[PDB]
Structure 1
């Protein structure tokens, strides 16, 4: 088909048809029949307007103005100008040709059958406001006015179309030739009574029927209406511009400094800085989690065989006995021989997670009749002050440990300079954050959530024991299989994915909770035994906690591995900005330093109230830890606070660059930000750090 199009027509005609039809906002390839029709129509109208010419008085020796082919905007404005200059009605459809003699717009068309019916239906479509000439492949012609075209033009057009018709059937193209009326089948659209009434009752105040609105829109000249409306508008409608200044900015959410409010609890799913993995060196083979947990407990047999618990702390509502018996059942199941990791002593599991205390649903009619059934008030989040453990979390998760848990596959050889730059950036990033404790915590988190999601494949009405395991590698190359504790997941009879399935997790730790009583108001902790590392006894506690999460939360935890890409993108944006200051890449220079440049240093934190600098590696580690904490501590409060602190930070930046920022309703922004600082540890610590950094910027801007 397309070959016929490019062979039977000149390149200019094909290009004009293609660019005029591509404005339909659709694929021009899969439907080329209309392309052929439009090309033939363009050729016909071009031929029609190449033989007859006019003069100062109208000597026949141009007379035809071509509107099709040109851009629709230019064509429409030209048609409107012609109609205005000639004092004639403008056709509602874009006429394909205009005549200077008759002072009327005209249309052309191509068909396959008799042209009389086509002409009559086109007349019905356009009424009598436009003239037409029509030709058909089967030697038929129709003209509204016999004084429109001469014999030469009609004969040439007829010969061309007859030749095209004859040639089409030679390559089996006439069979697939679509007609012309199909593209304009729908021209009748009559509204029913109901829809007409709905339209009539949907007009702005001041009109009775939609006819009045239509006439008002099509007739009235509203020039100058905006000024008239604005003149009488009250002066009270003002943005109230206010130039911003350094002193205008104030600390956000000072209540967090109120010592009366309680400390923020530790609501993260898994222990991050207090983890304790029972290392068990392995060759490197992959084994089922149950076998790994069994071997790890066998190595530390003393902890496994602990039956008398030395309770150290208790939650407000949880029962220590039930949790301990559930943990004993979990370890018994882990240490058995059956392949399945399914609990068989469902008693304590059922009675420990409060799975039997759920209310029973009754028919709505009884509730309506009943008077004691009333909606319960929403438990709005409490308000808490600064929690000192978030600072320790951030400090420790950014340190370099002796083990790494990242092993990514390989990539093809790098050739292009951009590939070399990307590979260098990746090398520096991984080298910097390979052993960072945040990476290991992130891997544990994602692996545990993946296992939780997998266990929900077919087991939904049964309790499943899942060990919190991890695969780690050290500098020497020997790889270990760490076990961080266990967790039993309950049943979710409902098939919904956003339905909480209660899971209770027992994680080992080496930190005595009594040191920070406010850090664990939600944990039940025992003391199982004592490990020896360098001949010295260090205690081991078992933090037992009930929790509730849904399948979508499992998916979120699984995707929590995106913190790596997030941190890499942030570092790459920093490097791209540094390189954009210059004209060349700044990766090695800002990491290691070249002859011209020096190793870039970033302000990391505070030491005894004084600023401290550090290498770009420390900044990368802090960025990764911040991203991981943001993902782990994520709730609606955190995202809202970040979204509003965006605006506050942008205003501060504008202030720094001496751009003279102006604020309209500053207190509105401050209220929007403070609306989200209620109980999230990450949000509260972010507010504290923002206040500290704002103070530092204020005190440093006076120099």
Structure 2
């Protein structure tokens, strides 16, 4: 019907693509039109060298070596906020919820702690002039006093752009953009292998405290219509059990703290761009007796933030309270500078003891993608639930009965989550619900390309082990290459190295 013709500049192009034996598209079209199979594949295979083969290497309980973790100085903290070292100054006073302006809550929180002492530096940063970290805290205290003195709370404070706050915020500008012709003849224009770091105990302890129950209810999910379908009843059973076992977990505290902090940062950066705005670090939790509460972990001083592209980075200075002395695990605190804020009297076995109260100050940076990813931490609760539900549904498909009650309504079930110096410890459902949630929250907090390249490559080495444990005679074409692919991801990430160390433990105990 139509007339789509190939003419010069497209016939000439078409005459140079076809294989290297024809000199025109018409010749090749005619050759293909007159093609009948004549056992070409068999002849080519016979001619092909026998070195081109896929030899199946048997996979036996002895083959799997433990993964080789990197070597070097111990890793260090990377999170935006302190995870298990956080100290909360709480109010326990509602204001009808929601309406309360954050800065007033920060003032009230700071008023509940008597014992402030003149700040002193305990752990120098070692890579920036330690002064101007002390002065930032002094300045924040001064402006807090100024706000208190004035009759009316401004409801949005803006720090004075002093010298110390400028240096801390990274205003040590990067070299100005210039023209390559201007700097054609200079010393060098070199455009950097990442340093390799080994495991440290702290990352394993931080995940132990992220699996523990707290005394406060951190997640208050909204209503759902009444349940009238049996499937709705089963779904409500699973969801309610998971929520009850998870609502008090510290992983949920991390979720809510991150959500609040990232929301505050994003709103402040999109609202007040030119000046440095003081953003309190606040999170609201309901206690064990139904009384609201408002916890102040610390302060965030935002920097100049004009963000058009997502990747544009805003630099802020985060100052978090804590009671964890830095001299216990110094290698963990390599990016923070530590000040001695005060003395807090806490109950010991013998009377009450005065323990120092520290502040961890770090100049961090975050873009808009790292704010939106961080306001969605509440979707970590929606992933652990699906993990638990997938296990339940798999073990219910193996059988032909709803195993929701055999999972949750059974005190005898115990999964091997943990390892003490006595054997694999087993915890009931509820430490598995909170353990998968901790894993999801830490995947969100410590997200990196290394983790995404280790989870994918370490899943293949896991299904082969499962096949061996199911007596399916696993075989691998190249197992040395798979180990290399796994190990190229273990470089310096504290989270990924831990997941590797977990893998070694599983292989040793699973195959033995």
The alignment's TM-score, normalised by the length of structure 2, stands at 0.94
**2:453–2:489 Cα contact (<8 Å) kept:** yes
How many residue pairs end up in the alignment? Answer: 500
Aligned to 2:150: none
Answer whether contact 1:390 1:682 (CA < 8 A) is retained: yes
Cα drift, residue 669 of structure 1: 0.4
Give the structure 2 partner of residue 549 of structure 1: 366
Question: Does the alignment pair 1:275 with 2:86?
Answer: yes
| 1:571–1:620 CA contact under 8 A, matched in 2 | yes
CA contact (8 A) 1:290 1:467 kept: yes
Counterpart in 2 of 1:93?
none
- SS, match of residue 248 in structure 2: coil
Higher RCO structure, 1 or 2 (CA under 8 Å, sep 6+): 2
CA offsets 1:383-441 (integer angstroms, 9 cap, x no match): 12221001111111111111121011000011111111110001110111111111111
What's the CA shift for 1:610? Answer: 1.5
Identify the match of residue 185 of structure 2 among 363, 370, 375. 370
Report the alpha carbon displacement of residue 241 of structure 1 after superposing the two structures with TM: 1.5
RMSD in angstroms over aligned alpha carbons?
A: 1.6
Match in the other structure for 1:332: 142
Give the CA deviation at 1:689: 1.3
Alignment of 1:291-690 (within 5 A): 291-300=104-113, 302-303=115-116, 306=117, 308-335=118-145, 336=147, 337-367=153-183, 369-376=184-191, 378=192, 380-493=193-306, 495-534=308-347, 535-593=352-410, 599-690=412-503
Q: Do the aligned partners of 1:333 and 1:342 also contact (CA within 8 Å) in 2? A: no
Cα displacement (A) at 1:372: 2.3
1:285 paired residue number = 97
Superposition map of 1:97-246 within 5 A: 125=1, 187-246=2-61
Q: CA deviation at 1:491?
A: 1.3
Residue 631 of structure 1 deviates from its aligned partner by 1.2
Asked if the contact 2:269–2:302 (Cα under 8 Å) also holds between the matched residues in 1, the reply is no
Q: CA deviation at 1:656?
A: 0.7
Kindly indicate whether the alpha-carbon contact (under 8 Å) linking 2:119 and 2:342 is maintained by their aligned counterparts in 1: no
Quote the Cα distance in structure 2 between the aligned partners of 1:560 and 1:339. Answer: 27
Shift of 1:301: 5.0
Shift of 1:302: 4.0
Relative to 1, partners in 2 of residues 1:275 and 1:317: Cα closer, same or farther, differing over 3 Å?
Answer: same
Cα offset for 1:494? 5.7
2:101–2:155 CA contact under 8 A, matched in 1: no
Structure 1 gap segments, 5+ residues each: 1-124, 126-186
Deviation, 1:565, is 0.7
1:556-595 Cα deviation digits (max 9, x unpaired): 11122221111000000111112112111111121113xx
Q: Which of these two proteins has the greater Rg computed from alpha carbons?
A: 1
What is the CA deviation profile of residues 578-625 of structure 1, one whole-angstrom value per residue up to 9, with x for unaligned ones? 2112111111121113xxxx6321112122242221111111111111
Residue deviations 1:497-546 (CA, integer Å, cap 9, x gap) = 20221111000001101011111111100111122344542321000011
Runs of at least 5 residues in structure 2 that lack an aligned partner in the other structure: 148-152
Query: Match of 1:518, SS?
Result: helix
